[PDB]
Amino acid sequence: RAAYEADLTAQQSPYVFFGTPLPPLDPDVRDDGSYVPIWKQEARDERGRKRFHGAFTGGWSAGYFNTVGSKEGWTPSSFVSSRTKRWKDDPNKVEQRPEDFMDEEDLADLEESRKLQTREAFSGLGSTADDAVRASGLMGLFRVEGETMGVKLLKKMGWKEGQGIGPKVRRKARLGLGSDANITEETHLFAPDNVPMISFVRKTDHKGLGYAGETGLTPLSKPRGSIGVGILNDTGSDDEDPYELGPKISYNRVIRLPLDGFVFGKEPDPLISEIIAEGKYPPPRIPPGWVSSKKPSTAEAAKSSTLDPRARAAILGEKQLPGKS
């Protein structure tokens, strides 16, 4: 029946010259790659049969058919040494690693426990873990950001955090002495301030602008650990605590007629009003006597463009960043 699925895949997906074609959409041939929820999935082993094999993974057998041995058996490798051929200075030191004594299940669980995370110098997608550090008060005043290296490379070229970017601002100061303008105003070159970011509130509803909406009601309040009762006998978590009844009680310490539903604007929009208005700019005088002085490829130049940015910015009058000196 391999020829039937083979030429059915050839007929349904003829132009697959890259990757692997999908199995055909038919009731006869199942879809192995399709994701069928979890409440629809079945527990199968490496061989496809529906059984378990561990004692702590829900099987009625364990090991090599209820035996702690193996089909290949065990053979103790030998060890001989003397003053002449001493073991410590031999070149082929076969070391006694904790993996000769393990099994494929042990290695599988070892790599299962070994997770993946980004390095300290690079930030990842969706990383939101600094709020607990920052929203702590005096605890967060000592724990500063651990120098993600983009901030460090901006630091090297002349940036200090707490202020924005741009050309340097020539404002004198504020000393905390109110708004005194009697200062000499000799105007040191400061750094531009940081404009804040934007954070739009999530909008899934169709509720309009300025609408408060209906407010909700809150529910009426609400050697560590133990050996479990089973993942299927946990039912509704009938056990919380035997020694006292109920949840944790939190305590205080004290004791033309317009359209229907539309109102007429009391004032017109100014922004549409300057469209037909004369504006606030008088046109130029234009005295008689002025005369127009001017009487009435890119790809090839880009190919010949040998101007590297070291020499491209030289004619642009820009100061290059300091390098390795």
Binding site: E214, G216, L217, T218, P219, L220, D234, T235, G236, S237, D238
Partner: protein
């Protein structure tokens, strides 16, 4: 709040709900989110049903 709290004591126990229990939990959460519409529905049911 009291009515919904005593309705939760049966089924707020997490796990192994049938379809009607899940519908009840969805209805209770919907009533928690929008109390006024639920109260208007209840009063209409008392008047009419």
């Amino acid at each position: 709040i009291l009515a919904l709290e005593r309705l939760r004591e049966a089924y707020s126990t997490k796990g192994r709900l049938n379809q009607s229990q899940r519908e009840e939990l969805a209805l209770i959460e919907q009533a928690y989110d929008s109390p006024g519409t639920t109260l208007e529905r209840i009063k209409r049911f008392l008047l009419t049903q």
